[PDB]
Amino acid sequence: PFSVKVGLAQVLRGGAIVEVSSVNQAKLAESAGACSVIVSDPGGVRRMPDPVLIKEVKRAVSVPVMARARVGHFVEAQILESLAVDYIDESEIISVADDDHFINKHNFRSPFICGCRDTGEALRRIREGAAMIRIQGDLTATGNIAETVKNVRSLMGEVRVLNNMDDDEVFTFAKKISAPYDLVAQTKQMGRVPVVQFASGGITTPADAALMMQLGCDGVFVGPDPFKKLRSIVQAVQHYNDPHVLAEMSSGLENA
Amino acid sequence: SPFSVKVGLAQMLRGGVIMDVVNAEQARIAEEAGACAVMALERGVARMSDPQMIKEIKQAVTIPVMAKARIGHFVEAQILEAIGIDYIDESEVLTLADEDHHINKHNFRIPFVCGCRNLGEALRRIREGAAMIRTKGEAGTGNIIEAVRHVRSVNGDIRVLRNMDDDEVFTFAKKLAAPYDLVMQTKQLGRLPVVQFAAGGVATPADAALMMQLGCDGVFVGGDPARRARAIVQAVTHYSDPEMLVEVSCGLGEA
Amino acid sequence: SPFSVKVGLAQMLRGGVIMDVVNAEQARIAEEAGACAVMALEIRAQGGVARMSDPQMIKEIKQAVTIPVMAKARIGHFVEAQILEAIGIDYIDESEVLTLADEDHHINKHNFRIPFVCGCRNLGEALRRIREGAAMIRTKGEAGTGNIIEAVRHVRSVNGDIRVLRNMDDDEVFTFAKKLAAPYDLVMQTKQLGRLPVVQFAAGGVATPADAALMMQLGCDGVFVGIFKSGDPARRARAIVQAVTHYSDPEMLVEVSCGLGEA
Amino acid sequence: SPFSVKVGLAQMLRGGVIMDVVNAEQARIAEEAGACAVMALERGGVARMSDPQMIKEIKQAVTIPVMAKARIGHFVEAQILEAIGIDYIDESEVLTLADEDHHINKHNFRIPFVCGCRNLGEALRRIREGAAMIRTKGEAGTGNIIEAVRHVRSVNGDIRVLRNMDDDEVFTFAKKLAAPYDLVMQTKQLGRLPVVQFAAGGVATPADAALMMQLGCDGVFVGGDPARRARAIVQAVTHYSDPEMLVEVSCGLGEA
Amino acid sequence: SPFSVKVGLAQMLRGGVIMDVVNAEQARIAEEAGACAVMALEIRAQGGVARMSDPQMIKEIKQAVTIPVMAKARIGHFVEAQILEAIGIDYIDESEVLTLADEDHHINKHNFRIPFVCGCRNLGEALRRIREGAAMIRTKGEAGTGNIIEAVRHVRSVNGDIRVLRNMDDDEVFTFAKKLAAPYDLVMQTKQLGRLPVVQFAAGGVATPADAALMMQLGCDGVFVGIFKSGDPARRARAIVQAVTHYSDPEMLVEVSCGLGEA
């Protein structure tokens, strides 16, 4: 059944996922062509969103709906799975509830997305049962893609090193990145991370979104005039290799 | 050579002043004072400028138009090129986008400007495709001290390289962490193989002329703006004429 | 799988004492005293570089006895291994008592049809060696000292974590695998199984019958011994063998330890 | 180009074994056992280029190429070796370093040079200076191959990393190696070292030699019964992937 | 000036090999092999305190040869120098291979009519020795080892900075003099002249013809040698001399290096 969840998450390839806080924002995001919306209510402790709000968003749109659970908060996840979400993001953007263990994701029917900063971390989240990885930059609303670029490049580059590696050296490599050897082999044989990989953190402009795509990501998360910027980002991801399109979409974006 | 052509497009600026501008007004004022080109920008995180404000400036002047792209943000560059800009400045003044890599500038048709602090950094930017180098100093301070350090650094190392025993140049390339070929080319020429401007803190006519007397092909500039601009332009055109420098510096107004 | 088969092959060594031998006579004495297998080799007190032993002296030993014959290949030296496989030895010991040949990588033992023994000091190291294809594990203490203290540390270490792992909350095993730096699949397999998924011997400093029996009571499947560095080898070798077979019988242990000679 | 010709000269040594010799007798024993070339040397103390007298005697005693060592940076020693007809010059760190900060400018010679290295950056720097042949050196006079394995693996490892690397990241990679970008890209294109690569240091047995070949080396240097051990190693290099053969030549070799 | 005259005097040594000698016979062999001058002395492997040599043995050497005769005076020991001047030597080497006599000050060499040679390791040290009155400089590597590595470092150091200085922006030379801790006037004089304003020899570890020629190709005007600590001194001394005279001729270098004997 893990392969089923991994298959499901594929339908998301080529899309932008938008953080919404109201059915109003969820609708816009949908009309703008968002492939999915991630529901949240927003210092302080940041938790799973109110199941009521989540139900309104789910009812108010047709695209798949995602929600956040705190790292290691498997009960929050049980709730989300009970309310019938399409995806659960076990998210470090929210306040971690367990510093030593993540949710055992194979105990759920819902597909999970987890964050990562490097290959090892990605592979560990996946062995735990994540069906989708987001390569996370800044956890804050900084509007800076620097860390995202760092982590996307670290991910891609390790995959490329692994692809070419002398098989006899893969064992030591798995030890070094603290990843399950068998997933490392799978990643090597396939020449790519065995699940959908999205970029997330600081994506503020169409240029940012297109850059992540050109860097090899399968899509992006995004957290004045919001509708216009939303469609521009969707278009940017859809036409990421086309400069003229990108110029058009960036033209007159009030202010990011 | 497509690179040599880019290098040539930049030389045409040798002897001029490039001025930052944020609207058609400033851009017009800068062209009126005699700027050899204008640098378009809107000013947190600092990014490429809006393609609209750039186009407005491109139509409101006859001199070349430059624009900044964040270090490593090759898509911002792609966009700038598609806008038909004359020069792209992969600028550390904006918010760094890739801490480990610069844009591969050879993948572009437009000529690129890159900053540097020493010879190695300059040669590395050039190898990446930069067709023009601005030895940077301190940005936003009005203090020229750092720009002077870096100009002296670059020029000083070039002179050292010029007279160096050939057999020692390999080790020198390693220490500079620079491409050996580009280093031997710099030794053969006796200067940077590309145009070299100074930027950072250039606040007065004297500052500008100093940079020129230190050996810079020109300068970037970031009371009475129109007056100061002309005075700075004149300073660069007549950098070794004290009478001129005195004239255009007199009654300059709070800088 | 051919790995399941190599693992199975090693099952036959359970309750056994493997003995180092440097010639024929010794290999005969080792078999005569009931050793389950011999380990051919031609170190601490001398120095120099210790490598694979000359095939000639390996061939002679394999001809002198009918019990399985082992040989050491330097860590990472996959060509020494290829040569041993070609010579038709029963088991290859990729042995850290020889001079390390590769500091970053062990031999890829799957690439061989002949079963491998690998040393370990803790659980993670054992599970890593196994994933590399090791069909048998020996927790090595310290070599050539006659002191068993380090073997005891390692045996307790491995067995200890195995018991920890056995009763561990399922959701915490991932993190445990990380901390162990060992493949998660093999860790869960060790959890479900309640022990090392392969044969596990003790090695290093086993000098007396009491030592050998101690290892068995700590939960090992057998022991390696370096016997000939003592007064009377035959009697001592016989005593250690008997000790392993009767490890939980103090009366017998007293019997075989009596008048053993200088250890 | 004169450099490509020197490189070509070194290629005719591929699949061979180079042996140290200190007299004409050894040189013959070495050639008799099928050595591709011999290395002339007269041996604490300061180690220098050997006497041309003994070099001339060895070049006369054999028909295979004769190599000799020059101290690192000692370009005059190299001029002397070139003037006496030596086929290859080994700018060798097993001699007493003569210059701590610069190697010989090898382009200024007509004779092809061999240089040692411990990693890729070092190999490329030597090549840029004119080296036509690289030997990855472990340690000298110990009989322990562990260091050679490290270096061979280090060089071959980085080459593999380089082969599959994103083009835009090669600049930074060249910096980190502190190696000439041109040569780095050329190494990327070829997918291997642009020159012949041998292994040296601690090769004491047939198995050692075959291991180096199996790791990727184009050949090896070698520093009981010599005439027997010599042929065994030669045979090892020629048939490095033939275990049966490796068993036969290692059988009853004697004390190493 | 009398300093211009002493500097001029040393010009005659260019292309020369100066040889250490401990008696007459040697001084004769040194001149017979074409040494431009000898250095009389009566250290590393022995210890004790090394001082000026006894005049008697200096007088005997000066009588045995017709080429200039040098002698070492301990650093700072201006009285040892006065004694050497009185004895009528040609050059005094205020030599750091002898036991330092003053750790803070060198001999004031102007106070003498006889020309001085001083050691150096870099440009600043050379320019300081010159200002003190040194008429000739020898960049010393390391003494009594037969290893040339340090001489090469120092030669390259001095010559390197001289090239840096030659092309340096005039306004930056002041700071360069400070960093060098060397008199600004002498620095500018070195800049304008493109080299050391005095004769500059290499010294330390020069053991073979290739060594000597190497120093010359790096830009030295000659070399010091310690020859008699080898197999056949005469042949070797002759070879080093020939090497200095034909430093840019590999064929000749091969000729004279052939069958030299133990170095």
From Swiss-Prot, chain A:
Keywords: Acetylation, Cytoplasm, Pyridoxal phosphate. The keyword Acetylation applies. GO terms for cellular component: cytosol. Expressed in callus tissues, flowers and roots. Weakly expressed in leaves and stems. One of its GO terms (molecular function) is protein heterodimerization activity. The protein has no function in the formation of pyridoxal 5'-phosphate. Belongs to the PdxS/SNZ family. Homodimer or heterodimer with PDX1.1 or PDX1.3. No interaction with PDX2. Unlike PDX1.1 or PDX1.3, PDX1.2 is unable to interact with PDX2 and restore prototrophy in yeast snz1 mutants. This is Pyridoxal 5'-phosphate synthase-like subunit PDX1.2. It comes from Arabidopsis thaliana.
Swiss-Prot record, chains C, E:
One of its GO terms (cellular component) is plasma membrane. Signal peptide: none annotated. GO terms for molecular function: protein heterodimerization activity; protein homodimerization activity; pyridoxal 5'-phosphate synthase (glutamine hydrolysing) activity. Expressed in cotyledons, rapidly dividing root stele tissues, stems, leaves, flowers, mature pollen, and siliques. The keyword Cytoplasm applies. The keyword Iron does not apply. Its EC number is 4.3.3.6. It is found in: Cytoplasm; Cell membrane; Membrane. D-glyceraldehyde 3-phosphate binds at residue 156. The active site is at 72 (schiff-base intermediate with d-ribose 5-phosphate). Disruption phenotype: Plants have a lower leaf carotenoid and chlorophyll a and b content, and are impaired both in root cell division and in root cell elongation. Mutant rsr4-1 can be complemented by the addition of any of the vitamin B6 vitamers, except pyridoxal 5'-phosphate. It catalyses: aldehydo-D-ribose 5-phosphate + D-glyceraldehyde 3-phosphate + L-glutamine = pyridoxal 5'-phosphate + L-glutamate + phosphate + 3 H2O + H(+). Changing residue 34 to S: In rsr4-1; strongly reduced oligomerization and 63% reduction in pyridoxal biosynthesis. Catalyzes the formation of pyridoxal 5'-phosphate from ribose 5-phosphate (RBP), glyceraldehyde 3-phosphate (G3P) and ammonia. The ammonia is provided by PDX2. Can also use ribulose 5-phosphate and dihydroxyacetone phosphate as substrates, resulting from enzyme-catalyzed isomerization of RBP and G3P, respectively. Also plays an indirect role in resistance to singlet oxygen-generating photosensitizers. Vitamin B6 is an essential quencher of singlet oxygen in plants, that can protect cellular membranes from lipid peroxidation. Homodimer or heterodimer with PDX1.1 or PDX1.2. Interacts with PDX2. This is Pyridoxal 5'-phosphate synthase subunit PDX1.3. It comes from Arabidopsis thaliana. The gene is PDX13.
